[PDB]
Every structure is written in structure tokens, then in C-alpha cells.
């Protein structure tokens, strides 16, 4: 939920860690076109470190 994002060529990098993982707030938005979860099943994130 930021007013300004980055462009496709100048894609941003944000490193955030040392925290509670909090995979529940990310489902706040309804109109999600894609929620691709290759590699890790979308419901088994909340117990991984």
C-alpha cells in the first residue's frame, strides 16, 4: 500500500527481516489477479523459517 511504485526496468529492492513473518495481512486485498506460489504451497508458509 504505497502511492508510488517502481518501473519495470528499475524494479525496486527491499530487504526486511528479523520479524514475525505475518502471512495473514497479505490476503487483505480481494482483486488479486495472480497469487502464484511455485515451490511452496500457499497454505504452508506460516511454519517455515
Amino acid at each position: 500500500n504505497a502511492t508510488t511504485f517502481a518501473s519495470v526496468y528499475a524494479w525496486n529492492r527491499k530487504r526486511i527481516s528479523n520479524c514475525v513473518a505475518d502471512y495473514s495481512v497479505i490476503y487483505n486485498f480481494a482483486p488479486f489477479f495472480a497469487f502464484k506460489c511455485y515451490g511452496v504451497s500457499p497454505t504452508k508458509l506460516n511454519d517455515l523459517c
Binding site: 490476503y27 504451497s41 500457499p42 497454505t43
Partner: protein
């Protein structure tokens, strides 16, 4: 003998079954795929693997 000039695409394998298998068990059925945080119902489109 088993290889074909037209390709043996008929042979299949059930890699993506949901729950666990026990040794010496028989599992051949329709095997509908219902995963994700949504009811797939077999006809949705997002997660009909």
C-alpha cells in the same frame, strides 16, 4: 519395443496426489485436485492442477 516413433504420451503418473500413501496400497481413481485457499471444485481455473 516400448518406444514409439510417434511418442508414448499415453503413459501417465499420479505425482500430485494430496494426502500421503501407505506401503502396498492401491490408488487409482479420478483424483480431483482441491488445493489453495479456495474451493477449486474441479472447474474453477486458477488451481485446477
Amino acid at each position: 519395443l516400448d518406444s514409439k516413433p510417434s511418442g508414448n504420451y499415453n503413459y501417465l503418473y499420479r505425482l500430485f496426489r494430496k494426502s500421503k500413501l501407505k506401503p502396498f496400497e492401491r490408488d487409482i481413481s479420478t483424483e480431483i485436485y482441491q488445493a489453495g485457499n479456495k474451493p477449486c471444485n474441479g472447474v474453477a481455473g486458477p488451481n485446477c492442477y
